[PDB]
Amino acid sequence: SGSNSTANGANSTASGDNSTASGTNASATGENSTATGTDSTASGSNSTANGTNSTASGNNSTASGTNASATGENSTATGTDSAASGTNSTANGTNSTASGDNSTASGTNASATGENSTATGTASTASGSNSTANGANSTASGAGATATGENAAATGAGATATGNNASASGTSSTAGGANAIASGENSTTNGANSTASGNGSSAFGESAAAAGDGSTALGANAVASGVGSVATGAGSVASGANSSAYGTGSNATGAGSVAIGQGATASGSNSVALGTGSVASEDNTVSVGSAGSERRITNVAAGVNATDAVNVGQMKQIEDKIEEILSKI
Amino acid sequence: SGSNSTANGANSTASGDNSTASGTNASATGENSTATGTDSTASGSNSTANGTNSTASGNNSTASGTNASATGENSTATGTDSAASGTNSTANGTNSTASGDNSTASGTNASATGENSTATGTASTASGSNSTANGANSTASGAGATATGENAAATGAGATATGNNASASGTSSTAGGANAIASGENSTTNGANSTASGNGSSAFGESAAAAGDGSTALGANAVASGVGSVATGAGSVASGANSSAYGTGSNATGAGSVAIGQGATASGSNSVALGTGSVASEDNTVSVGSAGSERRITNVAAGVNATDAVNVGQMKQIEDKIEEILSKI
Amino acid sequence: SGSNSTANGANSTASGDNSTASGTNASATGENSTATGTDSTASGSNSTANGTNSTASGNNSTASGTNASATGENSTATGTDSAASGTNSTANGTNSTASGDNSTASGTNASATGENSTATGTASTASGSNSTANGANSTASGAGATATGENAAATGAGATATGNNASASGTSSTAGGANAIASGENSTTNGANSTASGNGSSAFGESAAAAGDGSTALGANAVASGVGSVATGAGSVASGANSSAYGTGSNATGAGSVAIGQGATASGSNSVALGTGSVASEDNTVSVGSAGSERRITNVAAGVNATDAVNVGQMKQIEDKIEEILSKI
Ligand code: NA
Ligand code: NA
Ligand code: NA
């Protein structure tokens, strides 16, 4: 009964201006409304409903598909049983739900229920505030969480996960790479199959592991398993408490040990192995090699204080003195 | 008036072949066109328009919703006031706009205006050429920019940002982690709340900070604030110009200083602190410990040149000589 | 002929309950079905078809647009020539295809053909199992591959690429940054224009390059080109086999060489340059400076074994002895 309006089908209603109802009990009551299908409803302003029992009751709403429902202001729902119920909500796919304000859900059973949430992919879930999930079966449930990849999961507050099966579960955790795990508080990992599980741990490289609290493991298969350990280099190990290893295959296993160079090994407490292949097994020493593989130390200035090193020139002056004491005797 | 065509409603037109117009002034003039709603228009080839004042005028266009407009070739627009105007453009959501060629925009007020641009999320913006934004309120405005996460922003040319509130604003900058900032030219940061603000700076770890030009900070809360500084380890600091710190809690504060080991500290100019807990405060020295905590240096080969170090065996030969000069006297 | 059903147009059929067919040969045969357009077909349960030759034959299917086809269970297709044929499949855009089970494809010519695949963007491709592509022209073709950014490509099994033109082509490879390349097996790179091309290589920083097998390059423009090389610092180079460089502009070019400090250079085989500006050119030595720029070594404990270093206090005891041998002579 509205202006420039048609109502075809039994008990259909076109009361809105510029409205077009069609189908048994199709109700196009909003202004500029179009309702198609049995029991379809376009009651909002500028609303369009297509499909049996479809509902476009929000202002500026569009619902397409059987039982599709666009009840939010500025809502759009496509697919059987889709629901766009938040303000500024958009749903595309069967049984998709965009129920948060400013939410967008795309894929069968995709769910964007947080404020400002976005879920893309079948059975993706963006349930945290300001959460973003992109990938089938992905989950961004933490506040500010972002998950990208199939089965990626960002569950910590401020967590970010990128990669198939990646998991960022600690507060302020970040994981990148397939199967990467950032589970410590304030943990960061990047590399497929890498793990940063200590609090304050950071790992970089495929299969790198920073399990110590405050540990840092950088390089493929690097291991920083001690508290406060640092390991840089593929296959490096810093397993002592407060240990430091630098170089491929370096090994700092003593408490406080330091190993610098490819294949350097330091097992002594507070010891240092300096140089490729150097070995420091004695506690509280600096080794510049190993037995049979000693190194000269060069560009040493003359020592002055009692615990400074001595250079050859200082010794040669004593030798010359003894020579002359050989003439005087 | 087209073949296999129906036109129900006043002043409706079905001139295209296989065309179906329905509604006051519904115009289904394209081939294989279907126009539903008052003033709806399906004028393109293989075009489908549903909703009051909806327009599908592109070839292979589909417009659904009041005022929805699919004017590009191969364009698809769903939602009230949606607009797919580029070639190969797709828009889903109220007031979404896909105006670039090869552009895709999903979410209320989402905007994909660059060539090859993709925006997913309420009020997301992909305005750069080859730009990608995924997250409510995200922005990829640089050329080749990619932004993922709610309120993520990639504004530099070639910038990439991943995480809630992440920001990549320098040229060729990359930020990963919630609240991460890559603001220097050619800067790279990964870790929640991390910052790479120097030109050529790189930071890895939660709250790591590389503010120096050409600086590198690796580990949770690491600080590389000097020009050309390098800090690796949780809580490491390299604040001197051209300083280097390796180990948890290491501190290289002198110009040109080097601190290697957990808790090593080097404040002297061009000094080196080698070993856990070592201290180098004297300018232009290498310290292997600290006063009271001296270390032996081991596996030292006999010195040859004047500035080589001397080992015990060389001294013992002088001692034996003096012993015999004790017999001869 | 179904209950609460209307069939307007020649040879249209509304046999389903609550079904509404409209248009020449429009077939609304499913329960709660709505078919609009010439030759449109809504045969599934809870199915809705809009557009000439549109087909909604899946249960809970919705097809919109000319030739649009929703044949999968729980399938939704929007756009001319769109096809949602997998179980739980969703397609939005002209010629989009969601043919995998649990697949979601958005954008003109977007293709989600893998199981659990998700493609967003014009001409995006998610063809691997558990693959995710987000960006125009992006490709996630590996098993578990994830690609984000325009023209991003994740082609390895378990590969993850983020950034415009980023490429992760090795097994378990991860690339982040515009133009980043992770091409080695188990390679990881993060930084625009960075490359990890060795097997087991890892690179961090803009334009960092880890081309050696088992190499690690950390810092802007760092180069770890030797087998097993490690370079940390902007502009650092570790080009020797099994070489290690730490510090901005450090250079470890000898086999087994180690350079620690900004501008330290070690060209000797198995040599070590320790300290800013130190130079180690002699094979199998540890240099603490360079000629003209020698450093004292401090906090050295008295040597005990033959290859331990000697400190000044040990030499002063010999000097005092010689003094007294000067009185006795
Ligand atoms: Na070990
Ligand atoms: Na400090
Ligand atoms: Na070089």
Coordinates of C-alpha atoms in Angstrom, one line a residue, chain B residues 139-265:
Chain B
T139 CA 45.1 0.7 7.3
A140 CA 47.4 -0.4 4.5
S141 CA 48.1 3.0 2.8
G142 CA 51.6 2.5 1.5
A143 CA 52.5 1.1 -1.8
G144 CA 52.7 -2.6 -1.3
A145 CA 51.7 -2.2 2.3
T146 CA 50.2 -5.1 4.3
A147 CA 48.5 -4.7 7.7
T148 CA 46.9 -7.4 9.8
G149 CA 45.2 -6.9 13.1
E150 CA 42.7 -4.5 14.6
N151 CA 44.0 -1.0 14.2
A152 CA 47.2 -2.3 12.5
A153 CA 48.8 0.4 10.2
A154 CA 51.2 -0.1 7.4
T155 CA 51.8 3.4 6.0
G156 CA 55.4 3.2 4.6
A157 CA 56.2 2.0 1.0
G158 CA 56.7 -1.7 1.3
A159 CA 55.7 -1.7 5.0
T160 CA 54.2 -4.8 6.7
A161 CA 52.5 -4.7 10.1
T162 CA 51.0 -7.7 12.0
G163 CA 49.4 -7.4 15.4
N164 CA 46.8 -5.3 17.2
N165 CA 47.9 -1.6 16.9
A166 CA 51.1 -2.6 15.1
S167 CA 52.6 0.2 13.1
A168 CA 55.1 0.0 10.2
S169 CA 55.7 3.6 9.0
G170 CA 59.2 3.6 7.6
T171 CA 60.1 2.7 4.1
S172 CA 60.6 -1.1 3.9
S173 CA 59.7 -1.4 7.5
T174 CA 58.3 -4.6 9.1
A175 CA 56.5 -4.8 12.5
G176 CA 55.2 -7.9 14.2
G177 CA 53.5 -8.1 17.6
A178 CA 50.8 -6.1 19.4
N179 CA 51.8 -2.4 19.7
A180 CA 55.0 -3.1 17.8
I181 CA 56.5 0.0 16.0
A182 CA 58.9 -0.1 13.0
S183 CA 59.3 3.7 12.3
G184 CA 62.8 3.9 11.0
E185 CA 63.7 3.6 7.4
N186 CA 64.5 0.0 6.7
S187 CA 63.5 -0.9 10.3
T188 CA 62.4 -4.4 11.4
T189 CA 60.8 -5.3 14.8
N190 CA 59.2 -8.4 16.1
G191 CA 57.8 -8.7 19.6
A192 CA 54.8 -7.1 21.4
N193 CA 55.6 -3.5 22.4
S194 CA 59.0 -3.6 20.6
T195 CA 60.4 -0.6 18.8
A196 CA 62.8 -0.2 15.9
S197 CA 63.0 3.5 15.4
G198 CA 66.5 4.1 14.1
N199 CA 67.3 4.0 10.4
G200 CA 68.4 0.5 9.7
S201 CA 67.4 -0.7 13.2
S202 CA 66.3 -4.2 14.0
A203 CA 64.6 -5.4 17.3
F204 CA 63.5 -8.8 18.4
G205 CA 61.8 -9.6 21.7
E206 CA 59.0 -8.3 23.8
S207 CA 59.7 -4.6 24.6
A208 CA 63.0 -4.7 22.8
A209 CA 64.2 -1.3 21.6
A210 CA 66.6 -0.4 18.8
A211 CA 66.6 3.4 18.8
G212 CA 70.1 3.9 17.4
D213 CA 70.7 4.3 13.7
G214 CA 72.1 1.0 12.5
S215 CA 71.3 -0.7 15.9
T216 CA 70.3 -4.2 16.7
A217 CA 68.5 -5.3 19.9
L218 CA 67.8 -9.0 20.4
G219 CA 66.0 -10.3 23.5
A220 CA 63.2 -9.2 25.8
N221 CA 63.7 -5.6 26.9
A222 CA 67.1 -5.4 25.1
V223 CA 68.2 -1.8 24.4
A224 CA 70.5 -0.8 21.5
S225 CA 70.3 2.9 21.8
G226 CA 73.7 3.9 20.6
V227 CA 74.6 4.6 17.0
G228 CA 75.7 1.2 15.6
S229 CA 75.0 -0.5 18.9
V230 CA 74.3 -4.3 19.2
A231 CA 72.7 -5.8 22.3
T232 CA 71.7 -9.5 22.5
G233 CA 70.2 -10.9 25.7
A234 CA 67.2 -10.1 27.8
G235 CA 67.9 -6.8 29.6
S236 CA 71.1 -6.2 27.7
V237 CA 72.1 -2.6 27.1
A238 CA 74.4 -1.2 24.3
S239 CA 74.2 2.5 24.8
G240 CA 77.6 3.6 23.8
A241 CA 78.3 4.7 20.2
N242 CA 79.5 1.6 18.3
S243 CA 79.0 -0.6 21.4
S244 CA 78.4 -4.3 21.6
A245 CA 76.8 -6.3 24.4
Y246 CA 76.2 -10.0 24.5
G247 CA 74.5 -11.8 27.4
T248 CA 71.6 -11.3 29.7
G249 CA 71.9 -8.1 31.6
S250 CA 75.2 -7.2 29.8
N251 CA 76.0 -3.4 29.7
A252 CA 78.2 -1.8 27.1
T253 CA 78.1 1.9 27.9
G254 CA 81.4 3.3 26.8
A255 CA 82.0 4.5 23.2
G256 CA 83.3 1.4 21.3
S257 CA 82.9 -0.8 24.4
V258 CA 82.3 -4.5 24.3
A259 CA 80.7 -6.6 27.0
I260 CA 80.5 -10.4 26.6
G261 CA 78.8 -12.5 29.2
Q262 CA 75.8 -12.3 31.6
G263 CA 76.2 -9.2 33.7
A264 CA 79.4 -8.1 32.0
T265 CA 79.9 -4.3 32.1

